[PDB]
Amino acid sequence: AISELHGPRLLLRAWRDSDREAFAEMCADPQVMEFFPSVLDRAQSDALVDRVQAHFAERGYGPWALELPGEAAFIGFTGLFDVTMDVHFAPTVAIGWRLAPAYWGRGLAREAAETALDFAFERLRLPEVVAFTTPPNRRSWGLMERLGMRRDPAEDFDHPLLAADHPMRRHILYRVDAARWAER
Numbered sequence: 001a002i003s004e005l006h007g008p009r010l011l012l013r014a015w016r017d018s019d020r021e022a023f024a025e026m027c028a029d030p031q032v033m034e035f036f037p038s039v040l041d042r043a044q045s046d047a048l049v050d051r052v053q054a055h056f057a058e059r060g061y062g063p064w065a066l067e068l069p070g071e072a073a074f075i076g077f078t079g080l081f082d083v084t085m086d087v088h089f090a091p092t093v094a095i096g097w098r099l100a101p102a103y104w105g106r107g108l109a110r111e112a113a114e115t116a117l118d119f120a121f122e123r124l125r126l127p128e129v130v131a132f133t134t135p136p137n138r139r140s141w142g143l144m145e146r147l148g149m150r151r152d153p154a155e156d157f158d159h160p161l162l163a164a165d166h167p168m169r170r171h172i173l174y175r176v177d178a179a180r181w182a183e184r
């Protein structure tokens with residue numbers, strides 16, 4: 001009983017067991033995982049899918065599996081997740097995305113994110129959605145600003161689930177509120 005969302009090309013849907021093989025391939029891909037501490041093995045990939053499924057069970061939304069009707073069953077994920085960790089901007093709702101590299105450069109993450117944020121603001125009627133990444137991940141924060149999300153560099157933060165001296169600790173924060181989304 002999970003709400004599926006449609007864009008012109010994409011179906012944002014609940015995860016299926018058949019997704020785990022294709023998602024594990026992505027999580028083992030160094031180009032997909034470049035701006036994360038490590039690639040994941042199958043056990044770690046499956047544990048991430050388990051957390052996504054638990055988010056859907058608890059909240060009725062989550063990082064949707066991305067299907068491309070007419071083309072491919074599974075190309076990655078894009079969607080909303082609740083931020084509960086000890087950061088200055090919590091509690092709030094965030095948006096995240098991970099696409100198989102064959103699908104980059106097609107505006108498919110843009111379309112998935114527009115579909116997810118329409119749901120956030122029209123259906124859930126949330127006041128704001130945030131997103132966060134590392135400065136080197138230019139494809140990721142580039143998508144954030146193209147969506148109309150905006151960054152205050154003063155809100156840069158150290159990720160509280162990484163070591164205080166972790167080389168990838170430094171994150172940047174983007175925000176979009178309901179009014180800014182509507183004004184696009």
Ligand SMILES: CC(C)(COP(=O)(O)OP(=O)(O)OC[C@H]1O[C@@H](n2cnc3c(N)ncnc32)[C@H](O)[C@@H]1OP(=O)(O)O)[C@@H](O)C(=O)NCCC(=O)NCCS
Nearest residue numbers: 032097098099104105106107108109110132133139140143
């Ligand atoms: C982050 C990520 C989802 C971005 O995907 P993306 O395909 O670059 O993003 P978009 O969907 O906005 O597509 C933009 C590109 O498509 C092009 N494009 C083509 N048709 C388009 C259309 N109809 N609409 C928009 N852009 C279009 C743009 O020109 C741009 O190309 P460019 O990068 O050469 O300038 C992807 O790179 C990824 O999965 N990265 C690895 C995982 C990751 O780091 N996730 C984020 C962690 S914080």
